[PDB]
Amino acid sequence: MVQVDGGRFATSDLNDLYRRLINRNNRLKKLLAQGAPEIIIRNEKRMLQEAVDALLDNGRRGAPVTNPGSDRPLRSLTDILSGKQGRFRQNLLGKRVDYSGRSVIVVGPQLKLHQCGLPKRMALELFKPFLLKKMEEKGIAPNVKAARRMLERQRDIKDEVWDALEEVIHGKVVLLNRAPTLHRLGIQAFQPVLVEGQSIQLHPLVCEAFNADFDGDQMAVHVPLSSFAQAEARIQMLSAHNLLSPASGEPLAKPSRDIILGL
Amino acid sequence: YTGRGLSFLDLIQEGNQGLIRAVEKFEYKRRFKFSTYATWWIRQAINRAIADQARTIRIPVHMVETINKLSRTARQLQQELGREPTYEEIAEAMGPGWDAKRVEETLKIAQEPVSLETPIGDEKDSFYGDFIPDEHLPSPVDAATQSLLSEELEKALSKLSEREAMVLKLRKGLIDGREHTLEEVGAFFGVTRERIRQIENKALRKLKYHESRTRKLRDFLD
């Protein structure tokens, strides 16, 4: 039960389900203490059973319990864990992650197969903790906390910060993902080349594996952090290391469209 | 009494409790029929239950009856003025002891909490809870700068004397976690409350000189 920035409180449906159970349980205790007739006690016990059922699995038996003023069924414990919006499929089998970005993709004809064009503004945010360390090693900032304050305001960012960002991303790779990820080559590792602009430059030869075109498609960017994560991406997930289709063994990164036509 | 925050079966069971109380207090010597006297207790029990159980955040009966009066008064002013009344208009109609400030606070109190599972949009795949940040647990940045400040502060305290650094760590609660009094420190070392205040400032002054010479500690001050 949290107070939002506006000032109003937000609470989960379980609290209302718990209150109904306690209200019915407490009333039964007083009814039993007053020696109420069996008909009254029978109804209260029946309501207690339904209160327990609604808390555990609302709508499984009988009409779903809803809050006054709306027809929305209260989210019970079973609903929290089951379904596509449940805990398993929304927070355990998949998660939202840090050090991630997203932008519109454009064709990088001049890029190498292992290279992608990453916007500098995205890379500054994606590699910020590494950049703060690099800025402190150089004379850009006295310490990390002062370095972070410099990057908070765009107009306070010096040109030496961009030079330090290049040293940060040297040898490192990023993960490019386009949804839906129907196969494993829907995520590939590329060495980012810093480019002016806001769009990611994608190699033409990996478009087929991503099923990507350039009519508004967007891709997610991810930063592997540790040595294991970087080594796995540079060795196992690098685009230039994945040239044959795992489904058939045929070349998946191959000439297509204008490349075939020109040849 | 339906539609006031309690289900129909809840109203009946609460009404049954008033019915039981009616039987105990009923007197047939007055020759009044039971339904005449029972109706008062059945309605009483239903009203009290609504004032006690119809809100996630419980509000006492006096404020619930105050909130009910405010709505009734505002509605009566709305139908007579042909528009939504202002807080000054509502307060004046309420009576003495009421101003626009009190009406606004009462309305603020009467705000029911909103569900964390309320969907947004036609698609049933987003809720309010997905857009509310957690402001209790420290962020990774906040946790890191706290560790950075701790290691820079103990590094600066290394330049101090063995006892001088101990006093500040003990007076500021850098060791036990609690700020101690110059007295609570006067028992650890057996010194006078003015001894500490004498050196504690001297150790404080030396850190000021060190900080001005290195300036490795100002950025943490914000």
Partner: peptide, 13 residues
């Protein structure tokens, strides 16, 4: 399946 109708039947006896 209807608790209200079940209760009304019980009080109707």
């Amino acid at each position: 399946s209807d608790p209200v109708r079940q209760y009304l039947h019980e009080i109707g006896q």
